[PDB]
Structure formats: C-alpha cells, structure tokens
C-alpha cells in the first residue's frame, strides 16, 4: 500500500513495509495550536491506532487516502 508519511519533511507517499496494509491520520492540538494549527501525523500501520482523549484518527486501505488537510486524496 502507498501512503502519505510525515517522516520526510516534504511530505511524500511511500510504499509501506510488509504486513502493514493500512493508512492513518492523527490530528490534535499542541500548546502551539493557536499559532500553528493542529498537529498532523501520517504513516502506515498493521492495525489502526487506538484513539486517546481529544484527537482524530482516520484509517483506510486504498492508496494515498490519508492526505494532508491542505492536500487532496489524489
């Protein structure tokens, strides 16, 4: 599966390691939120990450379906 990732600093799409067929987004607020917006975390996983208090989580299976908010899922 090809998936957006926040590892690189110009966010790119990468083929994911074997066994990890899932994409995910995570979004929440820092103490920098009012001046930088919400934190964004992108990558792959074997199972979807558990949700904690006050954060969004998205999952999917097609390619590039976890885009940056300022981006589109092309």
């Amino acid at each position, epitope marked *: 599966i090809v998936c957006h990732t926040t590892a690189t600093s110009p966010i790119s799409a990468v083929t994911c390691p074997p066994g990890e067929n899932l994409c995910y987004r995570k979004m929440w607020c*820092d*103490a920098f939120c009012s001046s930088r917006g919400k934190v*964004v975390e992108l990558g792959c996983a074997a199972t979807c990450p558990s949700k904690k208090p006050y954060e969004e989580v998205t999952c999917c299976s097609t390619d590039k379906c976890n885009p940056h908010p300022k981006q589109r899922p092309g």
Partner: antibody
Amino acid sequence: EVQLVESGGGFVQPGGSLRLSCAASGFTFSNFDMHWVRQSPGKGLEWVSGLDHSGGAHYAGSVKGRFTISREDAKNSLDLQMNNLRVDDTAVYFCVRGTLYHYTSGSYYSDAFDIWGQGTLVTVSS
Amino acid sequence: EIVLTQSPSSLSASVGDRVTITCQASQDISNYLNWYQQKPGKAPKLLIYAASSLESGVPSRFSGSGSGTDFTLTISSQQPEDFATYYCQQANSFPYTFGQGTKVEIKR
C-alpha cells in the same frame, strides 16, 4: 528502534585534537537538525554545535574557530573535529536530534531535543 | 543570551507526594520551554515541550504550566520511577540554554 550511537571520545593533552563520530539507526540524520550538547560539573548542560537539515554548520561562541562539524556521507555519520582543545572542554558529549513536528501550517524544526545518544567522554588535562 | 535558573536545586519527596519544580528565565520566552528527565549515567529524555504538551509515552501525572518568565513542572503522584534530575531548556533564542538542574531525592 530509533537510536543514536556516538564514538571517538577520549583523552588528550591541551592543544590536542579529537574527532567524534555519530551514526543513527531508523532514520536519516540529514533529514533533521543534529546537535551536540556537552555535560560536565561546573558548567551543566551546554549547547556546542549544530548541523541543520540544510547542511549549514553552527557553533557556540566558546568553541567557534576550534570545532568543525560535517556530514561524512561515505561513513553515514556526523563528525565533529575538535582542535586546540583546552582543559574546560572536559565533558560528556551527547549527539542529539532535534524534533521535527508537522502542523496544518507547516514543518517546525528543533523545538526540542527528542533523541539523545548514549554519551562519550572527552578528557583534556596536563 | 537567555539565562535559566531552577528552584530549588534539590528537594525531597515521598511516593505519592505532589512535586513542583519552577524555572525562571532572564527575559520573556513565551512558552518555548522544554523539560527533560535524566537518571545518573544515562542521557536525558524529553518530557515536556511547549511548556505544557506531554511527549508521547510520558505518563499523564506529569504536567507543565507557565508562560513568559515563570514556568512550573508538576508530578501529581510521585512514583519510584520519577526520582531523577530534571532540566528546563529554552528554545526561544540562540543559543539554546539549560537550567542548572533539580534533583528529586527520596525522603526518609
């Protein structure tokens, strides 16, 4: 797992030379701002040098003109050449990665120091 | 250069105590302050950034308050794992600077 390993520390006479090398596992350090922070009793934790995510070198005042930092691609390592060493440079030297956080506004570097190496000792004495 | 001074330098506490360390800067740094934990013979570990945000994996009993020149690190329920030396670090101006450090010792 992500980790930092540093080497080259030792024990030299004032005016001598040393070279510290730092390698990473789990990430490419040229993606991040790398730093060197030294620790000794009498001066505490002190920022020393830095090689940012663009290849630029940075140095603290008390060490500029004597230290040099560079990517050595053929070694997959971060090197710190320490020349004209003096006694107060005796400390434990840490190789450190700066945090790279993504927001809806962009990427922000070195807000903090998230990954620290184990530390290598540098002794300068008569 | 911005100067950081922690208070106190040493403090005793029992398991279950509420521990409070303060950190003061030579001028305003907004909330660009980090907190690190260090055990002897070991590298420091990042605990707080942005003066208040916990780094992933850190237990929620840690909390950080403060903006401007006065900052606070608080352990609500002291555990044995939490006996170490704590450092604050500012990331507002260059160069980065740390406090002298504060050791949390076991009361008996």
